[PDB]
Amino acid sequence: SGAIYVGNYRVVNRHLATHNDWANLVWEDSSRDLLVSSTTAQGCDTIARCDCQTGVYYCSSRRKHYPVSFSKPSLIFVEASEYYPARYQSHLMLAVGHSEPGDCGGILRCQHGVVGIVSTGGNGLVGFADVRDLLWLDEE
Ligand SMILES: O=C1CC=C(OC(F)F)C=N1
Ligand SMILES: [Zn+2]
């Protein structure tokens, strides 16, 4: 589990969105595994605006933050998980690291701020849904 809180936006894995998220929907994209809902209170997070390929992510299944190198966001085939069938997921970054389903929502951060959230795992990789292209998160 986990979210990004930027301005009056809450960014979650689409597959973990709650009824309240869907009732306060700003934007969602199944292909990206992302959903954004509106918040009443302002959030503590700053979104990275950059093309970093190194950062640190939180792994809940290890209670640990790991430094990683990661691929640039791309359209990637993802094997079946407990929460999606095998499918193509867009805007996904991969790193070598540990990820189980419940690790989804852990933050990946670089020197510029929040890069994305854990969205995939298995076979020794961790996949992160990028948010750095979502410029509208920073305004309005
Ligand atoms: O292997 C699967 C097939 C379908 C899924 O989607 C949904 F049923 F959770 C999840 N895992
Ligand atoms: Zn960066």
Q: Resolution of the experimental model in angstroms, please?
A: 1.2
Question: Is the beta carbon of 85 within 6 A of some atom in ligand 1?
Answer: yes
Known catalytic residue at 15:
yes
Supply the residue whose CA is at minimum distance from atom 3 of ligand 1.
Answer: 85
Question: Is the beta carbon of 80 within 6 A of some atom in ligand 1?
Answer: yes
For residue 35, give the amino acid letter: L
Q: Which residues are annotated as a binding site for Zn(2+)?
A: 50, 52, 110, 112
Q: Which residues contact 25 (CB under 8 A, 6 or more apart)?
A: 35, 36, 37
Let me know: does 106 contact 2? Beta carbons within 8 Å: yes
Elucidated via: X-ray
What does the alpha-carbon distance between residue 40 and residue 12 come to, in Å, rounded to a whole number?
16
Pairing of the two strands 64-69 and 3-6? unpaired
C-alpha angle 125-131-135 in degrees, rounded to nearest 5: 160
Domain ranges across the chain: 3-44, 45-140
What does the alpha-carbon distance between residue 53 and residue 46 come to, in Å, rounded to a whole number?
17
